[PDB]
Design a protein around this ligand. Sequence first.
Ligand SMILES: [N-]=[N+]=NC[C@H]1O[C@@H](n2c(SCC(=O)NCCc3nc4ccccc4[nH]3)nc3c(N)ncnc32)[C@H](O)[C@@H]1O
Ligand SMILES: [N-]=[N+]=NC[C@H]1O[C@@H](n2c(SCC(=O)NCCc3nc4ccccc4[nH]3)nc3c(N)ncnc32)[C@H](O)[C@@H]1O
Ligand SMILES: [N-]=[N+]=NC[C@H]1O[C@@H](n2c(SCC(=O)NCCc3nc4ccccc4[nH]3)nc3c(N)ncnc32)[C@H](O)[C@@H]1O
Ligand SMILES: [N-]=[N+]=NC[C@H]1O[C@@H](n2c(SCC(=O)NCCc3nc4ccccc4[nH]3)nc3c(N)ncnc32)[C@H](O)[C@@H]1O
Lengths: 262, 263, 259, 259
Amino acid sequence: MKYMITSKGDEKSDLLRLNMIAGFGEYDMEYDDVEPEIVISIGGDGTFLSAFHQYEERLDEIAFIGIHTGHLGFYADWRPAEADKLVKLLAKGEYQKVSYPLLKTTVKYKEATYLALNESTVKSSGPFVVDVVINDIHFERFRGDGLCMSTPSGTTAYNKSLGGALMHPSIEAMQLTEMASINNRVYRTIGSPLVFPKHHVVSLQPVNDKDFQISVDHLSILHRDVQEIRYEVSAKKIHFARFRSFPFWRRVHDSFIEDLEH
Amino acid sequence: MKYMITSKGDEKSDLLRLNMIAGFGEYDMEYDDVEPEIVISIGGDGTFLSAFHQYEERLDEIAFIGIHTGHLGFYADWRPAEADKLVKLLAKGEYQKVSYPLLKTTVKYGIKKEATYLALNESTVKSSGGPFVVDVVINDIHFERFRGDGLCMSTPSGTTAYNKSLGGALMHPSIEAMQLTEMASINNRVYRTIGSPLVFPKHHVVSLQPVNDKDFQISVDHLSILHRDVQEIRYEVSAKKIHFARFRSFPFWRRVHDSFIED
Amino acid sequence: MKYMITSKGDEKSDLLRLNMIAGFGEYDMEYDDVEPEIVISIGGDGTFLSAFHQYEERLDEIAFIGIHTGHLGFYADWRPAEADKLVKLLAKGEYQKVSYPLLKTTVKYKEATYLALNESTVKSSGGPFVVDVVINDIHFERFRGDGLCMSTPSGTTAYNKSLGGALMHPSIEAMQLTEMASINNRVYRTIGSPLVFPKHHVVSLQPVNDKDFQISVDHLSILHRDVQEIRYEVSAKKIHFARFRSFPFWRRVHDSFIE
Amino acid sequence: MKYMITSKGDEKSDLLRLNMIAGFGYDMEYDDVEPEIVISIGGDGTFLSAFHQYEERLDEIAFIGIHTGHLGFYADWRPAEADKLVKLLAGEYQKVSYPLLKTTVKYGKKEATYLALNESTVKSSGGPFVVDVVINDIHFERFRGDGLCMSTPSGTTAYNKSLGGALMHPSIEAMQLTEMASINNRVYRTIGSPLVFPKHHVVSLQPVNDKDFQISVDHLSILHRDVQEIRYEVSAKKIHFARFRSFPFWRRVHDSFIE
Ligand SMILES: [N-]=[N+]=NC[C@H]1O[C@@H](n2c(SCC(=O)NCCc3nc4ccccc4[nH]3)nc3c(N)ncnc32)[C@H](O)[C@@H]1O
Ligand SMILES: [N-]=[N+]=NC[C@H]1O[C@@H](n2c(SCC(=O)NCCc3nc4ccccc4[nH]3)nc3c(N)ncnc32)[C@H](O)[C@@H]1O
Ligand SMILES: [N-]=[N+]=NC[C@H]1O[C@@H](n2c(SCC(=O)NCCc3nc4ccccc4[nH]3)nc3c(N)ncnc32)[C@H](O)[C@@H]1O
Ligand SMILES: [N-]=[N+]=NC[C@H]1O[C@@H](n2c(SCC(=O)NCCc3nc4ccccc4[nH]3)nc3c(N)ncnc32)[C@H](O)[C@@H]1O
């Protein structure tokens, strides 16, 4: 079937990319970059995030595959030495598909919609002060650096560094974590990370400042005259192609704990 | 239908209990503390915790109701003044049922029989005196070697309890999962731990296996007893769920708001 | 003696400033913004930091007084109405001096020294922040996250607290280093815990690849390019406060975060 | 001079112990009653016992730590260097002193005083732990949770570390307070952040309802009934180490947690 391969930029990612295209030359797989069914990412998680947003409009007919050139990633779980096996396994078209939940970021000032794979942070452009609304009701009023709404697969990313909990991707939910919150007498926050299920809307409403630095995954720009920032578990899901059992907790173990065989 | 009422023990709770019983008497409601279909807890979350474990063999045929006599609890929603409105909505059967996930705790010993436990809040494992050292095995795969005070596995509804004090994340009780939080992990070179709380879905099994000491202080909610000659402690989301009689619409996040932020 | 008064810029601060100078000249008080011995800050903690950075060269000859026009701060403690008796006591020279430790920040590439009253943070200029933490000419860890924060004892109740740092009394001559979203994994293992360093201890931050950092000293943040080394140590200079009443540090902490 | 050696219990410690004593068969006499030099073999736990065993004469005793297992913060030296320590001990060495924690327990009778090398903790006797934290005769917060930990500077790398506390260099004469599973709701509001108190500061823990507490001092933990007040302050007494080579505190922290 149709496929394509993305690259990080360095010689290593480019060389391996050309190798796989050559390998698929002995199989009935039409190389296409405008309408593929199998997107392969070579490099790191950042490279995977780019490939996701590059084809976020066709997540329905695309199974993503990750290859890490450097250290082991959570989206890039295939080794460069296993590229030969990858080509032969991809040829038959035999693979189970695994779907991960996504985050729907809606900004209201014209309504814009963004799909997050890892997280969607909201900072200020001075002091960051907003009001957290959960399903059309007041929960708290945040003051600090910002807020981070993470996906299950994204819990191991920025969410982890912010003290958030690690959540298995089989769970369809989203997690809200604080970023350098100041818990004084005036601005009281929950402190603890908050995990929201489907059909739950987290609305971030401004207090006095309308300019907020809204970021989505690997993309961070400045939005102007913002009135409301909505968050909910998107109906859209990213599909992966598995040929080998590589448990999510193993990837967590090999990343943060230890990797004895490497 | 059959029902029973549990009381905290104080005057206000016992007083409210007697009047509710008399209230149900004016309808088709039989008092039965052996096989109740409805269990009403009057007091607090701790009192509600006792009522749960009192009928943990009949959770499939029981809809629980909580009434707080003091401060607001996550299980005891109803106000004592709403007891009159409660006794009538129950008699008519004008209510829906909501279910929260539970935690299954299996304790295996040396070959003596294993013992299983259900938790509404959480289940914790600590040492019997010295250092607490266990191997955390996730789905038959080793994850970390833990050294510290203990480990806490919490239910979704139990996240607002001991879990939160330990730095755990607050989960919505609709989510079928379980959360593992550390209790003062040394987290060094020899005993490297994840640090972050772990949220496990259904059909996932967390195995705690002894390294040296085989005696552990195992706690389930309010109950905490010493277990000797332990070879394995298994955690997994139970297939059994606790059922709540729903009348109003009290948001879980509002209860969190009223308890930790402001009321 | 030779004094001066700084203002936030608002109407309330400027009015109270003029109402203070008028009562100042009523006594033996020569206004001097060149050789001051008493600096009165009117506004908030942010206004106080400005008054501090305005006279870093002569900190050993100046006693500071903070008056909050807005909310109560750890520096601006005096009330807008308590400025009446403040004029009298300040003229007779009865106040006691209280000294707080300061943080020295040196950027290396000809060096560039900075003094901080609250803290000094180092973040990346866009990409990931990866540096090597060197304690006393010995490597301690390789950090990868949003950045690091070296806080003064008096600055612990500020940004340091938000980052999970500890609150230490300003009578302790030390500096505290806290992490900013450390990834803390295999190849970038970090201590996690906030580190408190005494005097004569030097914390050197060294780049790995990118040498462009967003160095921030208190209220200002400069995008330093071509950075080779960032050194932190407890400065020999200390800020002096004119003590009139008795307002305990832990009491100020209680009023802020505990209600 | 007079000396003595304590053992952990395992064969690795007792065998190494007997080998060292034979090495002083110099002008060194084995005296466990009035020693001038105390050598601990095993781990930090073994060292703690040796400390409390000779807390009567801390001013005239230099301690040496040897770890048969993994590296400790008090048990510095590896058994491979045990021989070189013998020749060096028989007296070319300096003396390093670490601060200690004084714990005072009042009842409702007399009072009890204890010295801690690592930390002192106070927990409940079964139910919820609820106390009032009083700093210098001034109320600070009403704590509710598992307990509170007051740690020495050298004890920060122990229980304090696991509780999310800050790491302090043992040259800083202070004490650190950390929380144990604080519920931190609207009725029981706590600071959350660890608190570092200097000398001459008294932290008083006062009961609210229950007066029975599980008070621990280092490795010892006993139940105290009818407690009226638990006072914390930096002790005037210090523990003396016999410094041989140069093993920095931060390097020792690195080898424990970073590696
Ligand atoms: N790969 N990539 N590109 C973007 C992804 O990086 C992840 N991320 C980020 S991006 C948010 C940000 O403000 N970064 C500021 C500087 C920075 N970016 C980093 C990216 C990776 C590791 C460290 C970083 N520090 N920060 C952190 C952090 N501290 N620890 C861990 N992961 C982070 C985040 O999930 C984002 O999706
Ligand atoms: N006064 N003044 N100006 C500079 C002071 O800001 C204090 N600070 C800062 S400055 C870092 C920054 O630029 N953060 C972006 C969002 C922000 N800026 C703030 C400034 C003051 C209070 C809260 C802020 N949040 N952040 C935080 C934070 N999260 N919690 C607490 N205090 C913070 C810090 O102590 C510094 O000395
Ligand atoms: N060695 N020795 N024995 C006494 C010392 O153990 C230190 N400690 C303690 S004692 C507190 C306690 O009663 N914990 C429950 C059982 C326990 N003891 C331990 C000792 C070392 C590591 C883990 C432990 N868990 N806990 C912890 C902990 N989690 N991480 C690190 N160090 C701890 C404490 O500093 C005390 O001085
Ligand atoms: N009856 N009854 N209640 C039992 C419930 O107490 C909750 N819990 C516990 S029980 C564990 C324990 O033995 N802790 C030390 C003594 C204790 N018990 C408490 C009960 C409530 C609040 C604080 C407590 N401290 N600890 C804590 C804690 N630190 N913060 C918050 N909640 C806690 C836990 O969810 C358990 O289900």
